UniProtKB/Swiss-Prot annotation:
Organism, scientific name: Homo sapiens
Effect seen on changing V139G: Weakly impaired activity
Result of changing L194F: Normal activity
Protein name: Carbonic anhydrase 2
Effect on the protein of changing N59V: Reduced activity
Subunit composition and interactions: Interacts with SLC4A4. Interaction with SLC4A7 regulates SLC4A7 transporter activity. Interacts with SLC26A6 isoform 4 (via C-terminus cytoplasmic domain).
Reported effect, H61W: Impaired activity, rescued by 4-methylimidazole (4-MI). Impaired activity, not rescued by 4-methylimidazole (4-MI)
GO BP terms: angiotensin-activated signaling pathway; carbon dioxide transport; morphogenesis of an epithelium; neuron cellular homeostasis; positive regulation of cellular pH reduction; positive regulation of dipeptide transmembrane transport; positive regulation of synaptic transmission, GABAergic; regulation of chloride transport
SMART domains the UniProt entry points to: Carb_anhydrase (SM01057)
Site annotation Fine-tunes the proton-transfer properties of H-64: residues: Y4, N59, N64
EC number: 4.2.1.1, 4.2.1.69
Consequence when changing Q89P: In OPTB3; in Czechoslovakia
Length: 257
């Protein structure tokens, strides 16, 4: 089975998921000099006032903060998008050390981590149907750098001890994801894919320019998680990022000059 080792990591994925070598894979390097400013791009609308987080899960590759997506309670609209996209979950990708961890890169710079807020297009009715469509998902990607602590992340950090190993979950209600957003909603956008198997080419990526700052102690807690299940040989959950994929015949647009 797939993961982030020598034997089963990204460079192997294409054997089970041939779309790994497809025409619109993610993540990519964002070349900030080549990205075209597109004055036709609208501001992003992030409406998270009614978000209902339910649970946090160690799925063996990351942890997912899951939301009630049975109504339009936490929705992404505007920006590059047509229609309404419902928040289903967020998760992160991170490194063993602060010098790597992000999936997207900016002029080849790697951030310590990257947060993905995953949303599905309501015109397809459910997530499973949405991922079969080229406009099925919108993923908001937010870089993390290490410096000051992010107060709004701490509730997430402090539950991780309870979901150390693959398959564990914990109640995680009343968490407000607005506390994870940067001040600016300036973004880059391009058509891409899920960054884990099945790597489906169903994502409109929206990558914010401005990173959030987390503390070294916050990220250190991410790195105590385990990819393994309870009782199994400990393999720390670190370096759960896919590297940049070829851009191919794509254009990355900027919302800002
Ligand atoms: Zn992700």
């Amino acid at each position: 089975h797939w993961g982030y080792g020598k034997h089963n990591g990204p460079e192997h994925w294409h054997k089970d998921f041939p779309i790994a070598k497809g025409e619109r894979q993610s993540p990519v390097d964002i070349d900030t000099h080549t990205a075209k400013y597109d004055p036709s791009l609208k501001p992003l609308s992030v409406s998270y006032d009614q978000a209902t987080s339910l649970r946090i899960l160690n799925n063996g590759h990351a942890f997912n903060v899951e939301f009630d997506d049975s109504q339009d309670k936490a929705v992404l609209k505007g920006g590059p998008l047509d229609g309404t996209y419902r928040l289903i979950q967020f998760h992160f990708h991170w490194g063993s050390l602060d010098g790597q961890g992000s999936e997207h890169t900016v002029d080849k710079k790697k951030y310590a981590a990257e947060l993905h807020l995953v949303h599905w297009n309501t015109k397809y009715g459910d997530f499973g149907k949405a991922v079969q469509q080229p406009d099925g998902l919108a993923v908001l990607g937010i870089f993390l750098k290490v410096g000051s602590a992010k107060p709004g992340l701490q509730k997430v950090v402090d539950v991780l001890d309870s979901i150390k190993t693959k398959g564990k979950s914990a109640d995680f209600t009343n968490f407000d994801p607005r506390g994870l957003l940067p001040e600016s909603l300036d973004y880059w956008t391009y058509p891409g894919s899920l960054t884990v198997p099945p790597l489906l080419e169903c994502v409109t990526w929206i990558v914010l320019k401005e990173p959030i700052s987390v503390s070294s102690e916050q990220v250190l807690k991410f790195r105590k998680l385990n990819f393994n299940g309870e009782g199994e040989p400990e393999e720390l959950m670190v370096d759960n990022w896919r590297p940049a994929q070829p851009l191919k015949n794509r254009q990355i647009k900027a919302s800002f000059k």
